[PDB]
Amino acid sequence: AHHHHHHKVRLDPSRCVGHAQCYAVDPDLFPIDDSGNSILAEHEVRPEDMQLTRDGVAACPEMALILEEDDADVLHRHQPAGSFYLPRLEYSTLPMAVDRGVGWKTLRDAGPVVFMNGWYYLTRREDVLAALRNPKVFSSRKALQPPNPLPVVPLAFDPPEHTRYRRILQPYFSPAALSKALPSLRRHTVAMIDAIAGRGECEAMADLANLFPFQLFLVLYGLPLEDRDRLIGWKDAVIAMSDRPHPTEADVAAARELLEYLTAMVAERRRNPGPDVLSQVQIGEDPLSEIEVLGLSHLLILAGLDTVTAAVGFSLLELARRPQLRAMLRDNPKQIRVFIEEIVRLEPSAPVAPRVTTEPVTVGGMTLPAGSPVRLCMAAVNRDGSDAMSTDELVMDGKVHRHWGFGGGPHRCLGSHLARLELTLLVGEWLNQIPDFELAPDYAPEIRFPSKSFALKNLPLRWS
Ligand code: HEM
Ligand code: F3S
Ligand code: NI
Ligand code: NI
Ligand code: NI
Ligand code: NI
Ligand code: NI
Ligand code: NI
């Protein structure tokens, strides 16, 4: 018994991509810099800190924190294809509409690699996590730019270009940076909840979730608040047309009007820079060009808003069904954060990441030729059952869980800190003013499937 070995924890710097989940477990044990990346220095773990240290190590989706036995001494020194049968499924008949767990289980069980409708889906954690970390082989640039001259900054870039974009942009998107915005975001969120509360009922998607992200976006980036509904309209049309081989005249015009609006905004920020993000990325040691900030602005609008909308809906749905959970969470920011992580783990708004391979690669004993289109199944991995943080159930055990709902590897969601901030604000201020509410009768929650959204079609709520 009494040979109790002590432990040390260290950071593998090549694995950290700044998820900052470790910091959420304990900010003093797991410090981060102004870009949201761990600055933990290797050290002996105090016996009283062992459980929180294990929790932080368990929270990192890149496995970048390593706990090892502190056992160095004078003797023990520490040095400083086989598969030819391709499974095929039809995407559109996966059982997704009612229960994502049943849907991803159907896909997972067909095999490590499943061909559906032109794409190779990688369904298994080993392959997905490895592929996310291997941008040389699994390229984002080859997959994620429409043949559109406006660069999709930073989504459609590989290292080293991608690395520069992340170095430049992460200081503006970190927990430290966004904390300065929180009084503003909280004030606007309180106002939105107050508009809802006095009604006694809503259809939460159309009435709140569809509006809340763009409202806060305008506040964050200093855009005119009266432009919200025009901008939502443009966003909705440009999202809808991305799937269309032959966009309508209304589609083309919507895209043109959004481009013209953002072009004028970006040019004005370059002429008269203020203490805002879109101004400041355009000056300093390594400036972004106007076209780069324009591409970034389009990406934030088209990818950072409907994702939060969808997560709002799932958050309110689950609270509506669970009265005792509502009561625990109210005025409980630490457990609200636990809850929001479970919602993103179980109902990630972008459940797969597309890539194109640059060289042959063997996955599941199967070799995929160079140039293969590949979808990495984050959502399925989040539910693969391989540990207690990976079930199909909502798990409220007081701990921050690792998951891949915000992606992983270098493209890990740039807005992940913001998404968590907005979702925890919403849940907290909803429960503050609307502690008890229920689903309207005869409601069955479903997503629209197959489609470009994994969000609830609607969410009818009622209260007194
Ligand atoms: C719950 C809400 C959100 C979820 C589930 C989500 C999910 C994701 C995922 C999985 C990726 C990686 C895609 C890939 O590897 O190809 C990603 C990338 C990205 N997301 Fe988020 N997102 C959310 C909210 C936001 C917000 C609020 C913003 C900013 C306003 C945003 C901006 C971005 C950007 C700029 C990237 C590209 C990062 C890069 O390629 O380096 N997202 N998102
Ligand atoms: S910030 Fe922390 S959660 Fe992981 S990716 Fe870096 S050690
Ligand atoms: Ni002993
Ligand atoms: Ni002894
Ligand atoms: Ni001792
Ligand atoms: Ni040990
Ligand atoms: Ni050792
Ligand atoms: Ni030993």
Numbering used by the authors: -5 to 74, 1009 to 1075, 1077 to 1393
Paper text:
For catalysis, CYPs required electrons typically supplied by redox proteins, such as ferredoxins. Interestingly, two Mtb 3Fe–4S ferredoxins, Fdx and FdxE, are co-located in respective operons with cytochrome P450 (CYP) enzymes suggesting their functional relevance. Here, we explored the genome context for two ferredoxins, Fdx and FdxE, determined the binding kinetics between FdxE and CYP143, and solved three crystal structures: Fdx, CYP143, and a complex FdxE–CYP143.
We constructed a single protein containing FdxE fused via a linker to the N-term of CYP143. This protein was used to obtain a crystal structure of the FdxE−CYP143 complex at 1.6 Å resolution as well as for SAXS studies in solution. In the structure, FdxE binds to the proximal surface of CYP143 and has a typical fold of monocluster ferredoxins for Fdx. The buried area upon the complex formation between FdxE and CYP is 1,809 Å2. The shortest distance between the CYP143 heme group and the ferredoxin iron–sulfur cluster is 16.75 Å. As expected, several structural regions from the CYP143 proximal side participate in a complex formation, namely, helices C, K, and L and the meander preceding the heme-containing loop. The electron density of the iron–sulfur cluster of FdxE clearly identifies a [3Fe–4S] cluster coordinated by Fe—S bonds to cysteines Cys10, Cys16, and Cys54. Instead, the N1 atom of the imidazole ring of His13 forms a hydrogen bond with the O∑1 atom of Glu56 from the opposite loop around the cluster. The inner salt bridge in the meander, between residues Asp326 and His330, maintains its specific conformation so that Lys328 forms a salt bridge with Asp49 of FdxE.
